[PDB]
Design an enzyme around this catalytic site. Sequence first.
Site, mmCIF file in Angstrom:
data_model
loop_
_atom_site.group_PDB
_atom_site.id
_atom_site.type_symbol
_atom_site.label_atom_id
_atom_site.label_comp_id
_atom_site.label_asym_id
_atom_site.label_seq_id
_atom_site.Cartn_x
_atom_site.Cartn_y
_atom_site.Cartn_z
ATOM 1 N N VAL A 17 6.051 2.151 0.558
ATOM 2 C CA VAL A 17 6.369 3.123 1.600
ATOM 3 C C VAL A 17 6.306 4.561 1.073
ATOM 4 C CG1 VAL A 17 8.850 2.848 1.158
ATOM 5 C CG2 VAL A 17 8.082 3.867 3.314
ATOM 6 N N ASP A 120 -11.344 3.565 -1.455
ATOM 7 C CA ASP A 120 -10.837 3.310 -0.114
ATOM 8 C C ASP A 120 -10.678 4.577 0.735
ATOM 9 O OD1 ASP A 120 -9.970 1.650 1.978
ATOM 10 O OD2 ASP A 120 -7.873 1.798 1.347
#
Length: 273
Positions: A17, A120
């Site tokens: 997170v 990515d």
Amino acid sequence: MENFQKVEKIGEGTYGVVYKARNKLTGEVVALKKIRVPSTAIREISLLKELNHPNIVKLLDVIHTENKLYLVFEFLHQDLKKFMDASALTGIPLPLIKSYLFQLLQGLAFCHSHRVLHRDLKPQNLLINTEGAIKLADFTLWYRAPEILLGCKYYSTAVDIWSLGCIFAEMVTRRALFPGDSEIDQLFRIFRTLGTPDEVVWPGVTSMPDYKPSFPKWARQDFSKVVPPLDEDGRSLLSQMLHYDPNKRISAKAALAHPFFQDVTKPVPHLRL
Ligand SMILES: COc1cc(N)ccc1-c1ccc2c(-c3nc4c(N5CCN(C)CC5)cccc4[nH]3)n[nH]c2c1
Ligand SMILES: COc1cc(N)ccc1-c1ccc2c(-c3nc4c(N5CCN(C)CC5)cccc4[nH]3)n[nH]c2c1
């Protein structure tokens, strides 16, 4: 971590997170990632602290405490996805598309010169500020290069050029270029636009780990149809970023010299924060 005050949850990342937080020592507002630890990891991440460039989001601190790893980054206020969505009715003006593409090519050219790849890239990890800057962060299958989808495990810097080409097209058309929802759907969306690759256009393709001779054969489409009102300089550049063969795919450095950037400027976007 007692030195950090969490403000709000920014995201649920790939490996943990992310929060907006205040560094209590410096008073700075930062992006704090709590990783959910290997010694091989510490050394690799410790190297990336050194990799500093205006178009790469800075890694400020790496805190390894209580068997937990926290990565503290420069904070930016908006991602490209949000901005693309907010610009969807009108489109991002071409000069700003061109500016953003140019800057990301500078960031990539820097990273790639240090043998570091992103792997990515996607609108969600491209961050923008009020100054007209755009930055690579984290340094969906929609942006995955075909060699990755075909099972190449020793792929190159070219994978990032592919992803950026996909993002360039998406900025122009306001629609994702190859929006696949499975690995094979992704691959076949690519083939249906660019043509099923073969040994002519991509030597070695038929010996890639996941290549199947039973792949359907589709014909290549005209780029003019793929990214409409993008002009010929833009389409030329895009075509070179989307070459199947990673060895023929344009490098970031070569892309910066492309005629498409002859008139590049640095506009200020309108950001609602
Ligand atoms: C919001 O921060 C800025 C905004 C702007 N616009 C410009 C600069 C900065 C800035 C501020 C601080 C720093 C540091 C730094 N300071 C400390 C530190 N100090 C903090 C001060 N004092 C209470 C004693 C202890 C203790 C431990 C580590 C540190 N690292 N490095 N670089 C900085 C840049
Ligand atoms: C592992 O994270 C990194 C690794 C590396 N190697 C390098 C950079 C970073 C990094 C990542 C993000 C951020 C942000 C930031 N992100 C957001 C944001 N989100 C919500 C939507 N979306 C899913 C993502 C964008 C929404 C609003 C404000 C934001 N500010 N500031 N700085 C960052 C640094």
